[PDB]
Amino acid sequence: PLCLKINKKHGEQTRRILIENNLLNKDYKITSEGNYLYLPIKDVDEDILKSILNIEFELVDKELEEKPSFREIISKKYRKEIDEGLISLSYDVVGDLVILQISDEVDEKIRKEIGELAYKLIPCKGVFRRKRVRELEHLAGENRTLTIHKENGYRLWVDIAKVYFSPRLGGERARIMKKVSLNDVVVDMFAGVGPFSIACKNAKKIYAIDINPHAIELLKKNIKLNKLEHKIIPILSDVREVDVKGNRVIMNLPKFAHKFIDKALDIVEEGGVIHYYTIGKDFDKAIKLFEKKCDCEVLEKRIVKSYAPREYILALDFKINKK
Ligand SMILES: Nc1ncnc2c1ncn2[C@@H]1O[C@H](C[C@@H](N)CC[C@H](N)C(=O)O)[C@@H](O)[C@H]1O
Ligand SMILES: [Zn+2]
Ligand SMILES: [Zn+2]
Ligand SMILES: [Zn+2]
Ligand SMILES: [Zn+2]
């Protein structure tokens, strides 16, 4: 498939950089031919790669070997419509449930068939598909949308019909989890059911804020389940109206975080850190927004996942030196 071609002397270094940026397509075998290394890579453009690599490279097409199924079967049977949107090969597994990406236009009993296949080939108790928190269409197995998801050693109650939750962000949450220091006071601006907040358990105090009450209900259940009731303070409100202070501030709202930077700088103490999440073709825009608003330094930046062609969800840790 799509591969990143580089001189093999840079092999291990490039592999590591692709893994941290969720770009390594682990379903293929990195292959070495001649003095070149070919790394199977996920959807990405040459321009943004230049912001995470200083060596020369080439993106190319190439057959490579791999490291029942579902993705296997659906891919051929419905390749017709899949090939044109209707159906996606990508799906999410939140705890006990599976959520397919069937942009319905596909018949209903056709949707039940796929869900049924999924239910059959994928260990789960329920299968749904969708259409921000959107309405779900049940397609097989148990019809319960409430489940518990395990990640990074902790547990999270999630009701997929009520709040937004991406299991794909477990890696990014684990990254932050390890940077947290004992004396930190964390402000999780858009907490959902509390994933970053539970992840930041090393801190001495955490403020978990969200405007969705069901989200806050799951948050509370999660604070208890993980035994962090004397650590995490749940807050039902629009974050703009909350007056709290912290040295570590999390902004997990990609599409609109840019509209909340002023509030974030008001919460953050100087010398503190803001973990910003945004959508972009690269890191330039976000850096500029922050550079104009205060004196800061980027400490680490990562591509989190793809959003659409030449569009990605990005993470940047900004150290705020002076406001
Ligand atoms: N003005 C606001 N104040 C507080 N929370 C908000 C506001 N607007 C949206 N939200 C919440 O922002 C959240 C964005 C989600 N990406 C949070 C995900 C969560 N951090 C997780 O790790 O699962 C949603 O749960 C919204 O309910
Ligand atoms: Zn509720
Ligand atoms: Zn207490
Ligand atoms: Zn969101
Ligand atoms: Zn700045």
What distance, in Å, lies between the first and last C-alpha atoms of the chain? 47
The partner residues of 127 in beta bridges, in order of sequence, read 98, 140
The answer regarding whether domain 67-143 maps to CATH 2.40.40.20 reads: no
253, 267, 277, 278: residue to mutate for ligand 1 pocket, most atoms within 8 A of CB:
253
CATH annotation of 1-66: 3.30.70.2580
Domain ranges of the chain: 1-66, 67-143, 144-323
264 is written with which tokens?
């974030």
The experimental technique behind this entry is X-ray
Q: Which ligand is nearest to the CA of 227?
A: 3
- Rounded to a whole number of angstroms, the CA Rg of the chain reads 21
Q: How far is CA 185 from CA 73, 188, 208, in A?
A: 49, 10, 11
Backbone angles phi, psi at 128, to 5 degrees: -140, 175
Beta bridge partners of 187: 207, 249
Q: Which residue has the tokens 């103490």?
A: 269
- Do 299 and 319 meet the contact criterion of CB atoms below 8 Å apart? yes
Q: Return the closest-CA partner of residue 284 out of 5, 29, 47, 43.
A: 47
* Ligand number with the minimum distance to the CA of 230: 3
Distant-in-sequence, close-in-space partners of 130: CB < 8 Å, separation ≥ 6: 99, 101, 136, 137
Residues with CB under 6 A from ligand 1: 163-165, 169, 190-192, 195-196, 209-212, 215, 238-240, 252-253
For 43, 67, 263, the CA distances from 307, given in Å and listed in that order, are 10, 26, 26
Spell out a b/e string for 32-43, using b for 16 or more CB atoms within 10 Å of the CB, else e: eeeeebbbbbbe
Distance 253 CA to ligand 3 centre (A): 28
CB 137 within 8 A of CB 125: no
Q: How far apart are CA 313 and CA 259, in angstroms?
A: 16
Residue numbers followed by a gap, the chain, C–N over 2.5 Å? 67, 131
Contact 281, 312 (CB under 8 A): yes
238 is in an annotated binding site: yes
For the chain, the helix, strand and coil percentages under 3-state DSSP, each to the nearest 5: 30, 35, 35
Atom of ligand 1 nearest to the CA of 191: 20
Same fold, 1-66 and 67-143: no
The alpha carbon of residue 198 and the mean position of all alpha carbons in its chain are separated, in whole angstroms, by: 16
For tokens 């949107």, name the residue.
85
Q: Closest Cα to residue 133, out of 145, 142, 143?
A: 145
Cα within 13 Å of Cα(66), Cβ side = 2
Residue 170 contacts residue 177 (beta carbons within 8 Å): no
- DSSP per-residue letters across 238-274: -GGG----EEEEEE--TTTGGGGHHHHHHHEEEEEEE
Which homologous superfamily does the CATH classification assign to the domain defined by 144-323?
A: Vaccinia Virus protein VP39 (3.40.50.150)
Give resolution, Å, one decimal. 2.2
Distances (CA, A) of 239 to 134, 185, 260, 271, 313: 22, 16, 9, 22, 22
